[PDB]
Paper text:
The chemokine receptor CCR5 plays a vital role in immune surveillance and inflammation. CCR5 exerts its physiological functions by binding to multiple chemokines, such as macrophage inflammatory protein (MIP-1α, also known as CCL3) and RANTES (regulated on activation normal T cell expressed and secreted, also known as CCL5). Here we report three cryo-electron microscopy structures of Gi1 protein-coupled CCR5 in a ligand-free state and in complex with the chemokine MIP-1α or RANTES, as well as the crystal structure of MIP-1α-bound CCR5.
To obtain molecular details of CCR5-chemokine recognition at high resolution, crystallography studies of the CCR5–MIP-1α complex were also carried out. The complex protein was further optimized by introducing another six CCR5 mutations and inserting a rubredoxin fusion protein19 in the third intracellular loop (ICL3) of the receptor to improve the receptor stability and facilitate crystallization as suggested by previous structural studies of CCR5 and CCR916,20. Our functional data revealed limited effects of these mutations on receptor signaling with a wild-type level of MIP-1α potency (EC50) and 70–110% of maximum response (span), except for the mutation A2336.33D that forms a salt bridge with the intracellular tip of helix I to limit the conformational change of helix VI. The crystal structure of CCR5–MIP-1α was solved at 2.6 Å resolution. Our crystal structure of the CCR5–MIP-1α complex allowed observation of interactions between the chemokine and the distal N-terminal segment till residue P8 in CCR5, providing insights into the chemokine-receptor recognition. Similar to the binding mode previously proposed by modeling and NMR studies of CCR510,22, the receptor N terminus (residues P8–E18) binds to a cleft between the N-loop and the 40s-loop and β3-strand in MIP-1α. In the CCR5–MIP-1α structure three tyrosine residues in the receptor N terminus, Y10, Y14, and Y15, which are potentially sulfated and have been suggested to be essential for binding to positively charged residues on the binding surface of chemokines, are surrounded by four basic residues in MIP-1α including R17, K44, R45, and R47, with Y10 adjacent to K44 and R45 while Y14 and Y15 approaching R17 and R47. Although no polar interaction between these residues was observed due to lack of sulfation, this binding mode may represent a low-affinity binding state between the CCR5 N terminus and MIP-1α, as previous NMR studies using peptides corresponding to the N termini of CKRs indicated that nonsulfated peptides bound to the same region as the sulfopeptides, albeit more weakly.
Residue numbers in the entry: -93 to -27, 8 to 223, 1001 to 1017, 1019 to 1054, 227 to 313
Write the structure that this text describes.
């Protein structure tokens, strides 16, 4: 989704333009610093206007109900034209999106088919992997439209604008949520085996998938409500437009929705969960006395010659079960194995690679949030900033073709199911 503006307003008109000199108008993109109206005149030129004022609101009202030569430079301003931004987009991104659309679609249909036909959807983990691949496809469906939009202009109309925007973000938000669920799932399997026996069930997975999609809709509602297509001086766009009375509210809101859900939240999860997972994996192991039933606790004998900081492999062979009196020989490793712990390393790869490709975007959004602070709220800065945003978005969009390549890089069962058709 590009709200990349064709032009933005960093000033307005000083005095009311004569109504009859105005041909047409457009409302500027919410990607812009400031709420704005650009008026097109009965000369080719165009100028900036404040949507607050009754004259502007009345002019627009009249122009919507509808559908002499002056030098108005004395009191009006030309908008910031985003020539460089759009020219770079149209040149480079079409062949990339081609590329990732091809690899991505094939990739993610294969994963889906395999998860349903070979790995058979046995547990919640399989369910989330499946919903991840479906989120990735929903994002892919939209890519051919975006590439065209970049090369040319929006020509799919308003409904398509609203539904494609919907599918993009639903795909985005749900993709994030399922990577998070996959991480949390593996954390419970490894650490809190307590609750993991209820949580790992297929029914549990489906109930939490259904809720998750629904929340991904709620998350996406404002994006759909405020988005529409619009004629901007005989070029059509697909972008969002916020009410000028709540403009900053919405801008801040929607941007931080994305930073918080996309960067902050999953970073907390990842750190926490992989700190957790490492501690459990590195923990000293307990043992049980075969005849006795007594459990040796390697963190806990204050009565025997036993160092609380050491496990069973350091205790001399002379050691005898305190409860019953048999020697060390009669101890086994207390039957504890992480069979439940099926796919930890894969999820950690997927989680890391997600950051690799999407962090530059979330960072550039924070730069855009604090545009005002860095004095980036001017024409020349915003063109560099918008250009960074198109680049980092491009990177980000690439990631939807990568998941299914990881399933071969660090997976195993996804490789072996291909030897089926050679032998
Ligand atoms: Zn014993």
């Amino acid at each position: 989704a590009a709200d990349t503006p064709t032009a933005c307003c960093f000033s307005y008109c000083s005095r009311q333009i004569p109504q009859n000199f105005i041909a047409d108008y457009f409302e500027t993109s919410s990607q812009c610093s400031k709420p704005g109206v650009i008026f097109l005149t009965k000369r080719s030129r165009q100028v900036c206007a404040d949507p607050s004022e009754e004259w502007v609101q009345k002019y627009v009202s009249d122009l919507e109900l509808s559908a002499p030569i002056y030098d108005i430079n004395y009191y009006c301003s030309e908008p910031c034209q985003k020539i460089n931004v759009k020219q770079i987009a149209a040149r480079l991104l079409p062949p990339l999106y081609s590329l990732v659309f091809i690899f991505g679609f094939v990739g993610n249909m294969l994963v889906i088919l395999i998860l349903i036909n070979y790995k058979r959807l046995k547990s919640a983990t399989d369910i989330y992997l499946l919903n991840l691949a479906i989120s990735d496809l929903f994002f892919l469906l939209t890519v051919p439209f975006w590439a065209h939009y970049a090369a040319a202009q929006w020509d799919f109309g308003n409904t398509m604008c609203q539904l494609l925007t919907g599918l993009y973000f639903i795909g985005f938000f749900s993709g994030i949520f399922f990577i998070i669920l996959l991480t949390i799932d593996r954390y419970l399997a490894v650490v809190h085996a307590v609750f993991a026996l209820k949580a790992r069930t297929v029914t549990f997975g489906v109930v939490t998938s259904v809720i998750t999609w629904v929340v991904a809709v709620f998350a996406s509602l404002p994006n759909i409500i405020f988005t529409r297509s619009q004629k901007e001086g005989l070029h059509y766009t697909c972008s969002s437009h916020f009410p000028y009375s709540q403009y900053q509210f919405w801008k801040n809101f929607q941007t931080l929705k994305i930073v918080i859900l996309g960067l902050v939240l999953p970073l907390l999860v990842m750190v926490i969960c992989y700190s957790g997972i490492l501690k459990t994996l590195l923990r000293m192991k307990k043992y049980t006395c075969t005849v006795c039933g007594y459990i040796y606790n390697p963190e806990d004998d204050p009565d025997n010659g036993v160092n609380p900081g050491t496990d069973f492999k350091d205790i001399p062979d002379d050691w005898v079960c305190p409860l019953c009196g048999v020697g060390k020989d009669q101890f086994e490793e207390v039957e504890e194995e992480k069979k439940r712990h099926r796919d930890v390393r894969l999820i950690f790869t997927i989680m890391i690679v997600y950051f690799l490709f999407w962090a530059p975007y979330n960072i550039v959004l924070l730069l855009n949030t604090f545009q005002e602070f860095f004095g980036l709220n001017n024409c020349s800065s915003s063109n560099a900033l918008d250009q960074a945003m198109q680049v980092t978005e491009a990177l980000g969009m690439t990631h939807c073709c990568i998941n299914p390549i990881i399933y071969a890089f660090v997976g195993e069962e996804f490789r072996n199911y291909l030897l089926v058709f050679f032998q």
